[PDB]
C-alpha cells in the first residue's frame, strides 16, 4: 500500500528554478531508489535521472535530485526552464517486489483571443436515402479554446443525439471544434428550422439551416 504522491500541475516561467516533490505514504523514500522519468506527449518515456542524485549522460546538469527522508518527500530540482522541458514527470520506486510509479507532474510555463468562426450544413440527400440524418456544427479559428454548444429545434433546445468534440489546436495557433446532432429523417422535416448556437467569451454566433 505504498504510493508516490506527485503534484498534478507545476507551472513557472522559463529561466527560473522549480522543485517537484514525490511523497511516499507508508514506506520511507530512503528505503529504495527513486527514478524520475521525463516523457514527451506521444513518445516513449526517457529517464531524466536515477539513483536519486546522479545525472545520466545526455541530459544537462540542471536536472538535480535530492532526498529529504525526514518528510518522506523526494525532490527533483530543475533550474533554467526551457521550451523542451514542458513534459510529464513521473517518480518511481520499488517497495518490495512491486514497482510503484508516481502520479505525474504537468511541468508548464499566452495567445491572442480569436473569434469562433462558425459554419453549418444540413444533412445530405444521400444520408437521407440511408435512413439517417446528422446536423454538423463546426467551430474554428477561435481562442481561448473553451466553447459551449447548444442545438435548437426552431426554439426548443436539443440534447438527445448531440455529440461534440473538445477544442483542438490548429496550424495557425487557434483552436478548432465540432458538434454533431444525430437525427431521424422524419424529425429533420418535422421542424421548420434547425440552428446551432456557439457561445464564446459571452458573445454568441448563430447560424440556421432549413430543409430545402
Amino acid at each position: 500500500n505504498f504510493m508516490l504522491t506527485q503534484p498534478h500541475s507545476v507551472s513557472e516561467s522559463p529561466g527560473k528554478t522549480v522543485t517537484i516533490s514525490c511523497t511516499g505514504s507508508s514506506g520511507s523514500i530512503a528505503s529504495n531508489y527513486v527514478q524520475w522519468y521525463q516523457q514527451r506527449p506521444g513518445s516513449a518515456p526517457t529517464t531524466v535521472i536515477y539513483e536519486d542524485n546522479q545525472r545520466p549522460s545526455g541530459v544537462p546538469d540542471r536536472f538535480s535530485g535530492s532526498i529529504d527522508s525526514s518528510s518522506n518527500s523526494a525532490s527533483l530540482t530543475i533550474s533554467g526552464l526551457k521550451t523542451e522541458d514542458e513534459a510529464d514527470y513521473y517518480c518511481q520506486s520499488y517497495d518490495s517486489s512491486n514497482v510503484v510509479f508516481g502520479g505525474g507532474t504537468k511541468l508548464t510555463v499566452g495567445q491572442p483571443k480569436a473569434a469562433p468562426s462558425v459554419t453549418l450544413f444540413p444533412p445530405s440527400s444521400e444520408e437521407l436515402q440511408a435512413n439517417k440524418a446528422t446536423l454538423v456544427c463546426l467551430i474554428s479559428d477561435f481562442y481561448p479554446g473553451a466553447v459551449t454548444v447548444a442545438w435548437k429545434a426552431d426554439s426548443s433546445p436539443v440534447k438527445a443525439g448531440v455529440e461534440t468534440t473538445t477544442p483542438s489546436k490548429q496550424s495557425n495557433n487557434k483552436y478548432a471544434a465540432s458538434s454533431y446532432l444525430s437525427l431521424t429523417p422524419e424529425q429533420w422535416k418535422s421542424h421548420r428550422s434547425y440552428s446551432c448556437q456557439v457561445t464564446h467569451e459571452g458573445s454568441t454566433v448563430e447560424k440556421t439551416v432549413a430543409p430545402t
Binding site: 506527485q6 529504495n32 531508489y33 527514478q35 522519468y37 516513449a44 518515456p45 526517457t46 529517464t47 536515477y50 539513483e51 513521473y90 518511481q92 520506486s93 520499488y94 517486489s97 512491486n98 514497482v99 510503484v100 510509479f101 508516481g102 502520479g103 505525474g104 468562426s117 462558425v118 459554419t119 453549418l120 450544413f121 444540413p122 444533412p123 445530405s124 440527400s125 444521400e126 444520408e127 440511408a130 439517417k132 446528422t134 454538423v136 463546426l138 474554428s140 443525439g161 455529440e163 461534440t164 468534440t165 473538445t166 483542438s168 490548429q170 478548432a176 471544434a177 465540432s178 454533431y180 444525430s182 447560424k207 440556421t208 439551416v209 430545402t212
Partner: protein
C-alpha cells in the same frame, strides 16, 4: 546498441485474451542478466507497472493486476510476450515493453508504445456523407465545405482532399464516441465563395482496418 519492438494487434474485445509480444534486436535475452518488464500508460494518466520477468521462470506481478498477467520468455526467437485475461474497457492504455537491468532501478531503454483500444462490437466500414455549402454556410468572402465520417470502427481514419492537393485550410478533427459505441468525425476546408461552382472538391476517406476507401464529391446544395 539494442532496441525493443512490440507487435500484436492494437485491438481487443472485452472479456477476451490480449496477446502483445515485444521483440529484441541487437542483443540477447538470456545474456547480460537483463530483466524484462511491461509498463502501460493510459492516455492522460500516469504510468502503471504491470509486471517484470527474468530469462528464467522468475516473475512478479502488481497486486492490482495479480492472477491476470501471464508473461513468458522464448529464448529461441529472442523475444518475450505478455498475455492478459479478462480485459475490460478500463484497460485502454499505451503498452510499453521496458528493457530494465536493475529491479529497483530504471528502464533505461523504452520501446515505442503500441496503442490498445478495447474493441466494441466489430470493425465496421465508415459512412461518408457530403457536407454541401450554401448561402448560410458562408460568412463573408469565404465559404466552408467538408465531408462527414460517421459510424465507423475502429480508429483511425485518414481523410485527404483532392488526393492531398489541398492542405491549406484543411482541418482534421479528433473522433468522439457516439451514444452507441461507434465513432464519428469530419474534415472540412475553407475556400473562397467564388470557386464554389467552378472548382470540384473531392474528399478521400480511407479506413484501413475495414479496407474501405471512399471518394465523395462535395457540391453546393441543390434545393428541391
Amino acid at each position: 546498441q539494442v532496441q525493443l519492438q512490440e507487435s500484436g494487434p492494437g485491438l481487443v474485445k472485452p472479456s477476451e485474451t490480449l496477446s502483445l509480444t515485444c521483440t529484441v534486436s541487437g542483443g540477447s535475452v538470456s545474456s547480460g542478466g537483463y530483466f524484462w518488464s511491461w509498463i502501460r500508460q493510459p492516455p492522460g494518466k500516469g504510468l502503471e507497472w504491470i509486471g517484470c520477468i527474468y530469462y528464467s521462470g522468475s516473475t512478479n506481478y502488481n497486486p492490482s493486476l495479480k492472477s491476470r498477467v501471464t508473461i513468458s520468455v522464448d529464448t529461441s526467437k529472442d523475444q518475450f510476450s505478455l498475455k492478459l485475461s479478462s480485459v475490460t474497457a478500463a484497460d485502454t492504455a499505451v503498452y510499453y515493453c521496458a528493457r530494465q537491468l536493475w529491479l529497483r532501478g530504471r528502464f533505461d531503454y523504452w520501446g515505442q508504445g503500441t496503442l490498445v483500444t478495447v474493441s466494441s462490437a466489430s470493425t465496421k466500414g465508415p459512412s461518408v456523407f457530403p457536407l454541401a455549402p450554401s448561402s448560410k454556410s458562408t460568412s463573408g468572402g469565404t465559404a466552408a465545405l467538408g465531408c462527414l465520417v460517421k459510424d465507423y470502427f475502429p480508429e483511425p481514419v485518414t481523410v485527404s482532399w483532392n488526393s492531398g492537393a489541398l492542405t491549406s485550410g484543411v482541418h482534421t478533427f479528433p473522433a468522439v464516441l457516439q451514444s452507441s459505441g461507434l465513432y464519428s468525425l469530419s474534415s472540412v476546408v475553407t475556400v473562397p465563395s467564388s470557386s464554389l461552382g467552378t472548382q470540384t472538391y473531392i474528399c478521400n476517406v480511407n479506413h484501413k482496418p475495414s479496407n474501405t476507401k471512399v471518394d465523395k464529391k462535395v457540391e453546393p446544395k441543390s434545393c428541391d
